[PDB]
Design a protein around this ligand. Structure first.
Ligand SMILES: [Ca+2]
Ligand SMILES: [Cl-]
Ligand code: NA
Ligand SMILES: [Zn+2]
Length: 387
């Protein structure tokens, strides 16, 4: 399909994720398969990568993404900061694409919770925050342009394995310990140990607002024990909260689709249905961590109070497949099956792929998944979108 726009692509990770210089160069986008950003750039599709707080709230991450894109000091909003008890200002970025302030636009390709963050960035650009606007007026403090509303620079948002309606994983017994074991498993995939006090940061959680950071002589094991008991794990202003079924619905109540943006969703599944009661089990090849620690629960957990039934059992090892095609719980967004023509202001359900949560970004191997072809095909589709 002929190119219709020249907007660059911007990659955005989920509740794990790090910059290109982090993890000694092992890429979140590509993992053991390679470097996805490089493949796209080498094929004529200008691509950049964002790195935001993996455990931080989608709100915090959207503010971080904004500053990283246009340049400047991250501003979480005076009202938000005061309400949750963290710094109003975060780190300062040079800006990957300052041209966005003069008419330039982008295509955001997001994985996992990155999909929620991308949606929220669009919502904030379009409508800003009334609470922040009122607070700035009443307290005589500055206001970030992000909260003014009336802005637009995202041509499309593509989500891959995103928990738009949350994931029941959060309801597991011992979630807390298993979630950080997942972080350790991803570190191991990148050939990084969790019992070594590395002097270089290696994996920066970017918790400047909370005043948290791995200390000199501190291992990831020790650091994660502290994070478990910190506000980034115990507050409502967290990825943890937004990841839950309840929290995702809350997010859906205000984060809606913009009529000026194309939305694409890719779903993932890596399970088979059993013959006993219809529960779902991990297929051969699923990354070891998910197969042993998460999939069994995801494919068997039901919760009447939450409306979690049979349709929620199929999963990709981390997120329930039904949650991925687009926001539905507490959402007025429209979702339509891809019909050959991508449409604006609605979710274009691109289908379900037989790849697990980590395989889809290359962090876990899967020879049968042509990952390079998948992303190049996507880049071409995005480039074909009419502005
Ligand atoms: Ca695999
Ligand atoms: Cl600290
Ligand atoms: Na994830
Ligand atoms: Zn916050």
């Amino acid at each position: 399909s002929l190119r219709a726009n020249d907007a660059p692509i911007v990659l955005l990770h989920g509740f794990t994720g790090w910059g290109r210089e982090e993890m000694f160069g092992f890429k979140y986008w590509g993992g053991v398969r390679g470097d996805i950003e490089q493949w796209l750039n080498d094929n004529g599709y200008r691509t950049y990568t964002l790195a935001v707080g993996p455990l931080s709230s989608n709100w915090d991450r959207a503010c971080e993404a904004y500053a990283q894109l246009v340049g400047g000091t991250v501003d979480y909003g005076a009202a938000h900061a005061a309400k949750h008890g963290h710094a109003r200002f975060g780190r300062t970025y040079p800006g990957l694409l300052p041209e966005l302030k003069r008419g330039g636009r982008i295509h955001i390709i997001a994985h996992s919770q990155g999909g929620q963050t991308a949606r929220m960035l669009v919502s904030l650009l379009e409508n800003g925050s009334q609470e922040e606007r009122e607070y700035a007026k009443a307290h005589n403090v500055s206001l970030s342009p992000l909260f003014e509303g009336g802005h637009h620079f995202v041509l499309s948002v593509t989500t891959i394995a995103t928990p738009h309606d949350g994931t029941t994983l959060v309801n597991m017994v011992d979630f807390t310990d298993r979630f950080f074991d997942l972080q350790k498993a991803v570190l191991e995939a990148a050939a990084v140990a969790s019992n070594v006090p590395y002097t270089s940061q290696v994996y920066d959680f970017k918790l400047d607002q909370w005043g948290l950071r791995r200390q000199p002589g501190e291992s990831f094991d020790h650091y994660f024990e502290r994070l478990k008991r910190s506000p980034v794990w115990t507050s409502t202003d967290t990825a943890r909260y937004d990841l839950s079924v309840s929290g995702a619905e809350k997010l859906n109540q205000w984060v809606q689709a913009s009529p000026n943006t194309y939305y694409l969703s890719f779903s993932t599944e890596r399970t088979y249905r059993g013959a006993l009661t219809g529960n779902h089990y991990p297929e051969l090849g699923m990354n070891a961590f998910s197969a042993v620690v998460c999939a069994p629960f995801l494919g068997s957990y039901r919760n009447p109070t939450l409306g979690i039934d049979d349709r929620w059992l199929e999963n990709d090892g981390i997120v329930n497949t039904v949650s991925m095609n687009g926001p539905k719980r507490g959402s007025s967004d429209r979702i339509v099956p891809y019909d050959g023509t991508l449409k604006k202001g609605v979710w274009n359900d691109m289908g379900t792929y037989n790849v697990d949560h980590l395989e889809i970004i290359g962090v876990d191997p899967n020879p049968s998944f042509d990952i390079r072809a998948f992303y190049l095909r996507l880049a071409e589709q995005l480039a074909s979108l009419q502005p």
